[PDB]
């Protein structure tokens, strides 16, 4: 091409995405091994939410 970086843009972001929604959770197992110090190695993000607004005030 001539400079098309939009085909090749297109083209790589959709299998992207895919890849970071599955890939995303995977984090999430890491999280829920920090409680692992606590209790048990299991957590949520729904207790987490206190920071959502904290993080955004800031």
């Known amino acids: 091409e001539t ?8 083209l790589l972001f959709l299998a992207f995405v895919v890849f ?16 692992a110090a606590n209790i048990v190695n299991v957590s949520l993000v729904k207790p987490t939410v206190y920071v959502y607004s904290r993080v955004k005030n800031l």
Do not use: D, E, H, M
């Open 3 to 10: 400079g098309t970086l939009i085909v090749n843009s297109v």
């Open 20 to 35: 970071l929604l599955v890939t995303l959770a995977i984090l999430t197992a890491l999280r829920l091994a920090a409680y």
